[PDB]
Amino acid sequence: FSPNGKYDSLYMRNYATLKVKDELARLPGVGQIQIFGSGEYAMRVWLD
Amino acid sequence: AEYPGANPKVIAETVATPLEEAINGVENMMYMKSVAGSDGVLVTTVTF
Ligand SMILES: CCCCCCCCCCCCO[C@@H]1O[C@H](CO)[C@@H](O[C@H]2O[C@H](CO)[C@@H](O)[C@H](O)[C@H]2O)[C@H](O)[C@H]1O
């Protein structure tokens, strides 16, 4: 979490995916790691 | 796995890393190796 509002759920979910998830799956006894909240990064082209 | 025309660094980052993340949730594994060549081919050996 960001208690000061500096980061929203999207940034932190992708931060967990890119810097937390893999380093946690290396631990022993971990079968599954699941992320809940927001969504993956994606290139959004909002047309007019 | 195959990633035609992709540089081995790209194959290692975008292919090998997520398969290793998934495979880490296997039991009785001793060590995992990934070799990605300029032939576009990635081989990941999982030794138990
Ligand atoms: C913090 C909540 C923990 C709940 C513990 C889980 C046990 C509950 C009974 C089993 C059902 C869980 O079912 C679970 O549903 C979630 C949705 O939340 C799915 O989650 C899926 O959708 C969510 C929502 O977009 C994505 O963030 C996620 O990446 C994707 O995998 C999981 O893939 C599945 O494992």
Side-chain angles (χ1 to χ4, degrees):
Chain A
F1 57 71
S2 172
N4 289 339
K6 218 166 217 93
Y7 314 96
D8 66 316
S9 292
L10 155 70
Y11 177 90
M12 305 195 301
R13 174 203 217 280
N14 277 293
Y15 186 84
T17 287
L18 300 198
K19 299 271 193 173
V20 161
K21 195 196 181 197
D22 294 357
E23 219 77 25
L24 262 176
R26 181 168 343 260
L27 269 206
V30 184
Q32 198 61 262
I33 296 192
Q34 304 203 123
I35 304 329
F36 306 62
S38 179
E40 317 268 337
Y41 273 151
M43 205 51 140
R44 286 306 200 144
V45 178
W46 307 112
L47 296 159
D48 185 330
Chain B
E2 292 228 25
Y3 203 180
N7 201 281
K9 334 189 211 166
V10 169
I11 300 184
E13 295 231 24
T14 80
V15 198
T17 301
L19 316 96
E20 287 163 8
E21 188 279 327
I23 284 160
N24 252 331
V26 76
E27 33 202 343
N28 293 292
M29 87 151 309
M30 266 195 333
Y31 41 88
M32 176 161 36
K33 151 173 65 134
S34 286
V35 179
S38 53
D39 49 13
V41 192
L42 161 74
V43 186
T44 285
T45 313
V46 189
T47 323
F48 294 74

